Design an enzyme around this catalytic site. Structure first.
Site, short mmCIF file in Angstrom:
data_model
loop_
_atom_site.label_atom_id
_atom_site.label_comp_id
_atom_site.label_asym_id
_atom_site.label_seq_id
_atom_site.Cartn_x
_atom_site.Cartn_y
_atom_site.Cartn_z
N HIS A 41 0.83 -1.19 0.00
CA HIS A 41 0.00 0.00 0.00
C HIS A 41 0.87 1.25 0.00
O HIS A 41 2.07 1.21 0.30
CB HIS A 41 -0.96 0.00 1.19
CG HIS A 41 -0.32 0.32 2.50
ND1 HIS A 41 -0.91 1.14 3.44
CD2 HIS A 41 0.88 -0.05 3.02
CE1 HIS A 41 -0.11 1.25 4.48
NE2 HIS A 41 0.98 0.54 4.26
N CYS A 95 4.39 5.88 5.84
CA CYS A 95 4.33 4.64 6.57
C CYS A 95 5.71 4.01 6.56
O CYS A 95 6.46 4.16 5.59
CB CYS A 95 3.29 3.73 5.93
SG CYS A 95 3.09 2.22 6.76
N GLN A 113 -7.39 -3.07 9.73
CA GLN A 113 -8.56 -2.20 9.85
C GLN A 113 -9.59 -2.55 8.78
O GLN A 113 -9.25 -2.85 7.63
CB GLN A 113 -8.15 -0.73 9.73
CG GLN A 113 -7.33 -0.21 10.92
CD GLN A 113 -6.81 1.22 10.72
OE1 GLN A 113 -6.46 1.62 9.62
NE2 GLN A 113 -6.75 1.98 11.81
N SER A 136 -6.07 5.91 9.65
CA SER A 136 -4.69 6.28 9.40
C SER A 136 -4.56 7.33 8.31
O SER A 136 -3.59 8.09 8.30
CB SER A 136 -3.88 5.05 8.97
OG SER A 136 -3.92 4.06 9.98
N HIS A 139 -5.37 5.32 1.58
CA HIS A 139 -4.49 4.29 1.04
C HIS A 139 -4.77 4.03 -0.43
O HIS A 139 -5.91 4.13 -0.88
CB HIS A 139 -4.67 2.94 1.76
CG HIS A 139 -4.55 2.99 3.24
ND1 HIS A 139 -3.46 2.47 3.92
CD2 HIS A 139 -5.40 3.45 4.19
CE1 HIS A 139 -3.64 2.63 5.22
NE2 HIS A 139 -4.80 3.22 5.41
#
Length: 145
Positions: A41, A95, A113, A136, A139
């Site tokens: 991702h 990330c 998630q 977060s 993505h």
């Protein structure tokens, strides 16, 4: 139609296309469950991310709308072949997985998630999502296995 896919009409051209509401993927071509999938991702964070910080930026200040525009631009460049997914993830994913070209490894349901999990398991091998939203950030997901 496979799980999540619907038929729609393009606003600018009037041509039929296909949209997946789970992955937010869209494509002109007509599209055609494993215990585990492997995904990479690219995450773009924003000021409302659960932890608005990354290796790229100690304080992430961009708005959610600005993050979506960044995601949209990366998707454009990946789909045109101007950049590949791994190179953009390595450079720009908010990330620690950027160092692994975005690779998260394999996972089963019940570990990630929910919006991320649902999109991951709705992708076919080799397929990429549209923008997928989690606490977060936003993505782009590539199912690799």
């Amino acid at each position: 139609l496979p799980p999540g896919w619907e038929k729609a009409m393009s606003r600018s051209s009037g041509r039929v296309y296909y949209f997946n509401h789970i992955t937010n993927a869209s494509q002109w071509e007509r599209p055609s469950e494993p215990a585990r999938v492997r995904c990479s991702h690219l995450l773009v964070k924003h000021s409302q991310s659960r932890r608005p910080s990354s290796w790229r930026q100690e304080k992430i200040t961009r708005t959610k709308e600005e993050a979506l525009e960044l995601i949209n631009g990366y998707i454009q460049k990946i789909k045109s072949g101007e950049e590949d997914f791994e190179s953009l993830a390595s450079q720009f994913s908010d990330c620690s997985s950027a160092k692994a070209r975005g690779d998260l490894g394999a996972f089963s349901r019940g570990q990630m998630q929910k919006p991320f999990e649902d999109a991951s398991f709705a992708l076919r091998t080799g397929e990429m999502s549209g923008p997928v939203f989690t606490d977060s950030g936003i993505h782009i997901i590539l199912r690799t296995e």
